[PDB]
Design a protein around this ligand. Structure first.
Ligand SMILES: CCCCC1C(=O)N(c2ccccc2)N(c2ccccc2)C1=O
Length: 578
């Protein structure tokens, strides 16, 4: 039995959780109650398998068990139409069908949070149904969310209430801690969506290369043979979590933490504090540990990679191991380089040996390879340096609006809601990275953009409208950012045409938070730039300055939300003028 295997390792608690997460990630539209029922019916079965390892279908693979269970409610097309098809399938891929149907943008209603007085009560009354709901809402809204880590967010989510409800001012103690978690959860989720996308669309060799470079950065003193071992396991873990095998992912992940702590001295000296605490915390600790100090006397790369005479020979024997070594050797002594820049140089190195080794004289051909690295390294540095100066000037908000206009001009087809989200996140890079020394600015900024741009790619892949986004997204993982910065403005885009609904103005906007108020303005700018791509300089501002006047006036005007209509039609006249 397999279901028995995972049960003994994870135990009732985590086992019940992980399966809830899995069920939620598959049927995101299914109600909380039904999931709970299935989870139990499923957990009860497991209990019998432990004793009798052959009872009913205890000999089954999780895929068959889980699949059939869900298919007892999926067949209801009136609720989950396209789903029933999945259930009529067989073993080889009745699952590939499900995975294929995960929604990265579920049409699930917003998740508002009741007063601090109810949450605490509901928390204290029933502590298990409260937390179960949490995971349910997060896993169903983040189908790729790193499960093992979602159990970590749960432990803190609980600790938040456990303490705050016992305060003098619960609303003061909770709120903050809850906001902080709302953000970190999103960050951790996107960061992970990039991992599942890599593996799934580019293959595991691409994921491995990324890992090798990142680990070689964190663990400089770690030997290549050791890192490889870590990369091999690591891949496997994530390969599983992404395919939907949460249980084994959660299991294997623990094993890896166990290992990394056992062989602490061979990997990094910054793992201490991490290995002296609870599993879940220990795991989330290692995965976020700072780079170890750089080894003292380190030879020069050129020695074994451009000057040696056996380069090509070695490359032919086992290129994959050779290029892997190069990356490792270049990453370890360069924690000031983003991971995508390292994978670029590496790719430039390979392409070079390829054409060079089939020449009349290699050493002469590949002798000036480093000469080509300069341009690649410079580029990010400049972009970052420039985009940080601007950010400082304008501040976050103003900087976001800059990126809004710019990107909408690049890819006007893209949906307003998506451009608004991406551009805002893109703006977050300033407050996040610009306050860092050049030595840590590149890794922070560029690698972050890789996550933000991946969001744009997956979202866009649902309904492809811009072939330009498509190419930059599919052509090369490592080059996505330079690919986008290259794009200027679409010269084939035909400006949209105005219509009342191009934007509705109902007063309901005077109640929304300050945030959703900015958002509404930005969503406007996007719609403006879509209508008038070309004619655009300062007239946009002049217009956006007017848009603000409109809201303030009719939100403050005692008269019903009407002046927003009269003066709203008045402002439209002025707007068109510019
Ligand atoms: C929220 C996503 C986390 C991804 C991640 C992971 O699961 N492991 C990880 C897995 C188990 C225990 C500790 C960390 N490490 C990791 C980092 C460097 C070297 C090896 C592993 C990670 O960065």
């Amino acid at each position: 039995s397999e279901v028995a295997h995972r049960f003994k390792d994870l135990g009732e608690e985590n086992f019940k959780a992980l399966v809830l997460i899995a069920f939620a990630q598959y049927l995101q539209q299914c109600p909380f109650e039904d999931h709970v029922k299935l989870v139990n019916e499923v957990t009860e079965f497991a209990k019998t398998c432990v004793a009798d390892e052959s009872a009913e279908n205890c000999d089954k693979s999780l895929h068959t068990l889980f699949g059939d269970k869900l298919c007892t409610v999926a067949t209801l097309r009136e609720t989950y139409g396209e789903m029933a098809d999945c259930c009529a399938k067989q073993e080889p891929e009745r699952n590939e069908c499900f995975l294929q149907h995960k929604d990265d943008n579920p049409n699930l209603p917003r998740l508002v949070r009741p007063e601090v007085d109810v949450m605490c009560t509901a928390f204290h009354d029933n502590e298990e149904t409260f937390l179960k709901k949490y995971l349910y809402e997060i896993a169903r809204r983040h189908p790729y969310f790193y499960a093992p880590e979602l159990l970590f967010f749960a432990k803190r989510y609980k600790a938040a209430f456990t303490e705050c409800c016992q305060a003098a001012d619960k609303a003061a103690c909770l709120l903050p801690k809850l906001d902080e978690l709302r953000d970190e959860g999103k960050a951790s989720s996107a960061k992970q969506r990039l991992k599942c996308a890599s593996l799934q669309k580019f293959g595991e060799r691409a994921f491995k290369a990324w890992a090798v470079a990142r680990l070689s950065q964190r663990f400089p003193k770690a030997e290549f043979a050791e890192v490889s071992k870590l990369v091999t396991d690591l891949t496997k873990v994530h390969t599983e979590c992404c395919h939907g095998d949460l249980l084994e992912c959660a299991d294997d992940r623990a094993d890896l933490a166990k290992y990394i702590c056992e062989n602490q001295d061979s990997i990094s000296s910054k793992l201490k504090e991490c290995c002296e605490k609870p599993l879940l915390e220990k795991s989330h600790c290692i995965a976020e540990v700072e780079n170890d100090e750089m080894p003292a006397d380190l030879p020069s790369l050129a020695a074994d990679f451009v000057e040696s005479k056996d380069v090509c020979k070695n490359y032919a024997e086992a290129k994959d191991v050779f290029l892997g070594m190069f990356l490792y050797e270049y990453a370890r002594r360069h924690p000031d380089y983003s991971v995508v820049l390292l994978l670029r140089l590496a790719k430039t190195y390979e392409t070079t040996l390829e054409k060079c080794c089939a020449a009349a004289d290699p050493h002469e051909c590949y002798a000036k390879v480093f000469d080509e690295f300069k341009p690649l390294v410079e580029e990010p540095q400049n972009l970052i340096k420039q985009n940080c100066e601007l950010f400082e000037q304008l501040g976050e908000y103003k900087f976001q609006n800059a990126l809004l206009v710019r990107y909408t001009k690049k890819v006007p087809q893209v949906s307003t809601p998506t451009l608004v989200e991406v551009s805002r996140n893109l703006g977050k890079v300033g407050s996040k990275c610009c306050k860092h020394p050049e030595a840590k600015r590149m890794p922070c900024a560029e690698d972050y953009l890789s996550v933000v741009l991946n969001q744009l790619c997956v979202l866009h892949e649902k309904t492809p409208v811009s072939d330009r986004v498509t190419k930059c997204c599919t052509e090369s993982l490592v080059n996505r950012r330079p690919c986008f910065s290259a794009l200027e403005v679409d010269e084939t885009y035909v400006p949209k045409e105005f219509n009342a609904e191009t934007f509705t103005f109902h007063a309901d906007i005077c109640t929304l938070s300050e945030k959703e108020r900015q958002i509404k303005k930005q969503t406007a700018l996007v719609e403006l730039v879509k209508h008038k791509p070309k004619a655009t300089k300062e007239q946009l501002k002049a217009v956006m300055d007017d848009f603000a006047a409109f809201v303030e006036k009719c939100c403050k005007a005692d008269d019903k939300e009407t002046c927003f209509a009269e003066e709203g039609k008045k402002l439209v006249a002025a707007s068109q003028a510019a």
